[PDB]
Amino acid sequence: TKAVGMSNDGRFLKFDIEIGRGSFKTVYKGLDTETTVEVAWCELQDRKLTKSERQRFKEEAEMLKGLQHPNIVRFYDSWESTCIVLVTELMTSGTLKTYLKRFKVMKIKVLRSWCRQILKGLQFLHTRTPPIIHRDLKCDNIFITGPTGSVKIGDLGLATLKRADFAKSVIGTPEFMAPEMYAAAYDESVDVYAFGMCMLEMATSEYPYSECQNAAQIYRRVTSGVKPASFDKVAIPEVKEIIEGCIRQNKDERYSIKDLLNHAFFQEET
Ligand SMILES: COc1cccc(-c2cc(C(=O)N(C)[C@@H]3CCN(Cc4ccc(Cl)cc4)C3)c3ccccc3n2)c1
Numbered sequence: 708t709k710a711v712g713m714s715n716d717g718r719f720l721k722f723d724i725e726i727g728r729g730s731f732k733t734v735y736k737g738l739d740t741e742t743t744v745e746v747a748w749c750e751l752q753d754r755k756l757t758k759s760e761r762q763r764f765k766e767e768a769e770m771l772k773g774l775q776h777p778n779i780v781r782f783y784d785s786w787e788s789t790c791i792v793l794v795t796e797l798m799t800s801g802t803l804k805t806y807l808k809r810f811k812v813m814k815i816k817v818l819r820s821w822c823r824q825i826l827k828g829l830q831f832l833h834t835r836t837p838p839i840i841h842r843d844l845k846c847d848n849i850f851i852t853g854p855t856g857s858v859k860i861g862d863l864g865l866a867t868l869k870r871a872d873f874a875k876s877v878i879g880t881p882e883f884m885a886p887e888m889y890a891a892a893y894d895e896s897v898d899v900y901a902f903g904m905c906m907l908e909m910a911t912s913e914y915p916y917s918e919c920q921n922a923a924q925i926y927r928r929v930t931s932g933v934k935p936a937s938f939d940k941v942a943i944p945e946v947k948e949i950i951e952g953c954i955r956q957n958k959d960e961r962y963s964i965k966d967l968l969n970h971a972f973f974q975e976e977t
C-alpha cells in the first residue's frame with residue numbers, strides 16, 4: 708500500500724482506502740510508522756475558525772492526546788491541511804449501531820459486558836481534572852474492535868469540560884433568569900441519561916421514541932412522565948430498573964456512574 712498523504716513529522720501515513728463516510732467526515736485507513744499499527748485518518752470539513760478558536764482546538768487536542776483508557780478510543784494527533792485531519796485508534800469491528808442493525812435480541816451476557824465497558828469509559832472521563840462530559844453518547848459513537856471485541860467510546864467532538872461559573876472567564880450570574888437559562892447548568896448526569904437510552908436501545912433493538920414524528924415531540928413526553936414506548940417492552944426487570952434509574956427527568960434522582968458500576972447487575976462477572 709502506497710501513501711497518498713503524510714503528517715508533517717512523517718509519523719502518520721494516509722492510504723487511499725476509505726473505511727467510513729459521514730456527512731462532514733471521511734475516514735481513511737492510515738498507518739502509524741512509529742508502531743507499524745494502523746490508525747484511522749479522519750478528514751473533517753474545516754469551519755470558519757477564529758484565531759482564538761483555532762488556539763483552543765490545539766489546546767484541547769493536547770488534552771485529548773493525554774487520555775489513555777481501554778474503553779476510550781485513542782486520540783493521536785490533529786492538524787490542518789488543504790480541512791482538519793484527526794488521527795485516532797482504528798476500530799476494526801464497526802460501531803455498536805451496526806450490530807443492532809444486523810441482529811434483534813442481544814444476549815444478556817453481552818448486554819452486561821458491553822454496558823459495563825461503556826460505564827468504565829464514562830467513569831474515566833467524568834473523573835478527569837476537570838471532568839469531561841461527552842454530551843454525544845449514542846450507539847453510533849460506541850465502537851467494537853480487536854480480537855475480543857472490546858467496547859470503546861469514541862468521537863469526543865461535542866464534549867466539554869465541566870465548569871462551575873455561569874459564563875466562561877467572567878464571574879457573575881443573571882438575576883432575571885429565563886427558565887431555560889436556569890436549566891443550562893447541567894453536569895455529567897447528562898451522560899448517565901444518554902447511557903440509559905443506549906442501554907434501552909441495546910436491550911430492545913429499537914430506536915427510543917421511534918413512534919415520534921420529529922425532534923420537537925421527543926421532549927414533551929419525557930416531562931409529562933411518558934417514557935419511550937420501547938421502555939415498556941424491556942423483558943428483564945433488572946435491566947428495566949437500571950434504565951429507569953438513568954433516564955429519570957430530575958437529575959438528582961438518577962444513578963451516578965459509580966453507583967451503576969456497583970450495581971449487582973454489573974457486579975456479576977460472568
Ligand atoms: C478520543 O478523542 C476523540 C475521538 C474521536 C474524535 C475526536 C474529535 C476531536 C476533535 C478535536 O480535535 N477537538 C479539538 C475538538 C473540538 C471541540 N473539543 C471538545 C473537547 C474539549 C476538551 C476535551 Cl478534554 C475533549 C473534547 C474537541 C474534533 C473536532 C471537530 C470535530 C470532531 C472532532 N473529533 C476525539
Ligand SMILES: Nc1ncnc2c1ncn2[C@@H]1O[C@H](COP(=O)(O)OP(=O)(O)NP(=O)(O)O)[C@@H](O)[C@H]1O
Binds near residue numbers: 732799847
Ligand atoms: N476510529 C474509527 N475507526 C474505524 N471506522 C470509523 C472510525 N470512526 C468513524 N468510523 C466510520 O466512519 C463513519 C462516519 O463517522 P461519523 O461521521 O461519526 O458517522 P455519521 O454517519 O456521520 N453519524 P454521526 O455519528 O451523527 O456523525 C462511521 O459510521 C464509522 O463507520
Ligand SMILES: [Mn+2]
Binds near residue numbers: 847848862
Ligand atoms: Mn460518530
